[PDB]
Structure 1
């Protein structure tokens, strides 16, 4: 997250870190057994880390639970990032508590202009590299479809939305991928892509979770 703020320990209790020997992507806990992340975060060999604040210190509220299964969306296209969504099943259910909690799936799609909370352990610099240890947060508004398409001509599908600031300075970034965009208390987006981070006229692009609720529900009813 570039231009964000330190969230505060466990104030984003649905945020997970995906670890394959190191943090590599975020995700969102949607119930005690299942995480939503980005399909481009697929790796074999994922441990889900819940209850994290500093990802490099064991502070006492973590649960580390291996994945048993990962399910990339059946229509994921890694070239265009259309349908950039994946489900990860935990080998054992998390113990839900004040620091490890699920986020609701949406009923309606969020609206242009809504301010959402985006979070992660990704890079904090637009130019160069600096990875935080503690979770960072950013409030960013959803941009209109038309503004998103102008920023990325020929690249935005109906399964994507843009959020952020066309002046630059505030955005998600590498290492935030797969993490949450929460609007009105529900999971509306997944950190997916963008041209650099926090650059002018190049806002973040996010997987539009409301288009996937029926896939998510039928998949978790079956696995």
Structure 2
């Protein structure tokens, strides 16, 4: 997260770190057994780390649980990043409490101008490179579809939205990938892609979670 703030320990209780020897992506806990992340975060051997603040120090609220199964969206295209969403099932159910909690799925899509909270352990410099140990946060609005498409001609599908600041300086970044965009208590976005980070006229692009709720629910129901 570039241009954000220190969230505070366990103030984003649905935020997970995906670990394969090291943090490599964020994710969001959506029930005791399932995490939503980006398909471009797929790899084998994932340990889901819940309850984290400093990802380099055991502070007392962590739950480390290996993934049993990952399911990349059937239609994910890694060249365009269309349908950049994946589900991860935990080998055992997380213990839910105020510091480890699921985030609700949307019942409705969010509109341009909606304020959201974006969070993660990604780079805090554009590029520029500095990786934080504690969780970082950014409040940012959803941008209009037309400004999103104008920023990234030919690249924005119906499964993506832009959020952030066209002036630059405030964005998600590498290592935030897969993490949440939460708006009014609902998971509306997944950190997906962008041109660099925090660059003028290149806002963050996010997977549009409301399009996927039916797939998420039916996948959980049968797995």
So what's the TM-score if we normalise by structure 1? Answer: 1.00
Question: How far has the Cα of 1:75 moved from its partner?
Answer: 0.1
Q: For 1:175-209, what per-residue CA distance to the aligned partner results, in whole angstroms no more than 9, with x for missing partners?
A: 00000000011000000000000000000000000
Distance 1:183 1:98 in 2: 19
Supply the distance in 2 between the matched residues of 1:126 and 1:3 (Cα, whole angstroms).
9
RMSD of aligned alpha carbons: 0.3
After superposition, the C-alpha distances for 1:56-83 in whole angstroms (9 at most, x for unaligned) are 0000100000000000000000000000
- Separation (CA, whole Å) in 2 of partners of 1:169 and 1:141: 14
Distance in 2, matches of 1:215 and 1:206, equals: 18
Aligned to 2:11: 11
- Separation (CA, whole Å) in 1 of partners of 2:10 and 2:149: 35
Deviation at 1:91, TM superposition (A): 0.1
- The structural deviation recorded for 1:23 is 0.1
Q: Give the structure 2 partner of residue 63 of structure 1.
A: 63
Q: Distance in 1 between matches of 2:220 and 2:107?
A: 17
Q: Unpaired segments of 5 or more residues in structure 2?
A: none
* Superposed CA offset, 1:20-62 (max 9, x none): 0000000000000000000000010000000000000000100
TM-score, normalised to structure 2, is 1.00
Aligned-partner Cα distance in 2 for 1:169–1:115: 17
Decide which moves more: 126-135 or 82-91: 126-135
Give the drift of 1:127.
2.8
Aligned residue for 2:216, secondary structure, equals helix
Q: CA deviation at 1:167?
A: 0.3
SS in 2 for 1:52: coil
Write the distance in 2 (CA, Å) between the matches of 1:97 and 1:145: 37
Q: Unaligned regions of 5+ residues in structure 1, if any?
A: none
- Kindly state the Cα deviation for residue 128 of structure 1 after the two structures are TM-superposed: 1.4
The number of residues matched between the two structures is 223
